[PDB]
């Protein structure tokens, strides 16, 4: 299949990360993040969308702690707050970026219907042709985060080259993730290396060939 321009938008490990496709859809995502952040920053707007009795699978609006902007999220689990049995802690999957965060319901709103138009932007991937030098070492995860420059808008070229079945669910997961996992080649067109990211990891001792 054909190569595509992507950002790596979240990382769990070299064999579990998320990409966003660059193009009309990424422009539209950026605009939506701006519009959602503008909209939900107002308490009057938030009151139009107050969250009541949330449920697993629900698509909501939520504040991302680390930039205080508003994002689309899927509720993947709900559990009692162990200080306030009165309250709940929510496990959120950010559908356009791929990362997960635990959050207070106070920081969640119902999603205004027209914000559901754009398809969910984060695509879960694994890096083809690699395996751990061991579970991945933290140093390997760090190296992969460094090479992809995750969350810093670095353009990479990705190509789907294989698929594998998703590993057994050990936790609560997203509705979509319960479809094979695409295995990709990643390369950085701006790094002066002919090696793609898998080959860089292997030849530098952060990974083994599969």
């Amino acid at each position: 299949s054909k190569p595509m321009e992507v950002y790596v938008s979240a990382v769990a490990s070299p064999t579990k990360f998320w990409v966003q496709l660059i193009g009309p859809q990424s422009k539209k995502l950026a605009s939506m993040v701006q519009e959602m952040t503008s909209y939900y920053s107002s308490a009057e707007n938030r009151a139009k969308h107050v969250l009541t009795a949330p449920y697993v699978g629900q698509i909501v609006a939520a504040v991302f702690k680390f930039d205080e902007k508003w994002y689309r999220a899927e509720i993947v689990d709900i559990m009692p707050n162990q200080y306030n049995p009165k309250e709940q802690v929510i496990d959120l999957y950010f559908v356009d970026y791929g990362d997960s965060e635990y959050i207070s319901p106070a920081d969640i709103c119902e999603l205004r219907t027209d914000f559901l138009t754009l398809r969910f932007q984060a695509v879960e991937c694994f890096l083809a042709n690699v395996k751990s030098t061991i579970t991945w070492p933290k140093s390997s995860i760090a190296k992969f985060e460094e090479l992809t420059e995750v969350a810093h808008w670095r353009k990479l070229i990705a190509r789907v080259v294989t698929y594998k079945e998703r590993p057994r669910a050990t936790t609560a997961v997203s509705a979509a993730a319960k479809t094979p996992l695409p295995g990709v080649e990643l390369f950085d067109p701006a790094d002066n290396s002919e090696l793609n990211i898998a080959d860089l990891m292997i030849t530098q001792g952060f990974a083994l060939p599969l």
Binding site: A10, A12, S13, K16, F17, Y97, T170
Partner: peptide, 11 residues
């Protein structure tokens, strides 16, 4: 078990 994605944007 290394299954939760994370992202940390600059600023």
């Amino acid at each position: 078990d290394q299954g939760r994605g994370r992202r940390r944007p600059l600023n």
